[PDB]
């Protein structure tokens, strides 16, 4: 399977932005346990949501996944200059994980 | 509290093999999953495999299962990892990463990663 997100998203400081995560064999559901990673300047990774909507303590109010349609989605509310880096999404197949591309977002 | 650590990298020949370290601390190594990920210059996240640390069972991509052996040792709370046969395609920065496989399903903490560079 096929993960795919959008490649490149723009947004500036508070507003609402969102990016999605979709499947090369049907619609994503719960079944998929959809996670969205963080990766920062230099090579640093932190988790951020997992079984589709769970965030991980420590992460700020701002961010919330859910799904949208046949995809899951990351949404981000009042972004700062801070959430500007690489968002991955995974997704579980039964015997295996696929990662997605990545959307860079900048923050303008 | 919570930490992965592994080395930063490997300088290794062609052909040679490499063993990857990761030790984890400030929790319970056997209540959660451990997998390896491959990242490569401007790409993404490809996914290796796991182990369950309490039993040792492993899950590989089909792709790397001629190539990667996981393993662990329990006392010493360390996860490794081995790759065969290193070749261009393996220069890339590998990581550990920790899965609530129990709890509420996210891959939570991070190791570094180990950034593998093969060259004659």
């Known amino acids: 399977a096929v993960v795919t997100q959008e490649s490149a998203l723009t947004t500036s400081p508070g507003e609402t932005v969102t990016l999605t995560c979709r499947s090369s064999?049907?619609?994503?559901?719960?079944?998929?346990?959809a996670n969205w990673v963080q990766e920062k300047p230099d090579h640093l990774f932190t988790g951020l949501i997992g079984?589709?909507?769970n965030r991980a303590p420590g992460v700020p109010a701002r961010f919330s996944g859910s799904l949208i349609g046949n995809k899951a989605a990351l949404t981000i509310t009042g972004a700062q200059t801070e959430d500007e880096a690489i968002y991955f999404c995974a997704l579980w197949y039964s015997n295996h994980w696929v990662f997605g591309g990545g959307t860079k977002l900048t923050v303008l | 509290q919570v930490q992965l650590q592994q080395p930063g990298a490997e300088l290794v020949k062609p052909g040679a093999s490499v063993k990857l370290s990761c030790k984890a601390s400030g929790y319970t190594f056997t209540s959660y999953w451990m997998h390896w990920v491959k990242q490569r210059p401007g790409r993404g996240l490809e996914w290796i495999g796991r182990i369950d640390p309490n039993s040792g069972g492993t899950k590989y991509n089909e792709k790397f299962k001629s190539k990667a052996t996981l393993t662990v040792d329990k006392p010493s709370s360390t996860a490794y990892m081995q790759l065969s046969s290193l070749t261009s395609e393996d220069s890339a920065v590998y990581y550990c990463?920790?899965?609530?496989?129990?709890?509420?399903?996210?891959?939570?903490?991070w190791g570094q990663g180990t950034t593998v560079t093969v060259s004659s």
């Open positions: 990463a920790r899965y609530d496989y129990y709890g509420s399903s996210y891959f939570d903490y």
């Open positions: 064999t049907g619609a994503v559901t719960t079944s998929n346990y």
């Open positions: 079984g589709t909507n």
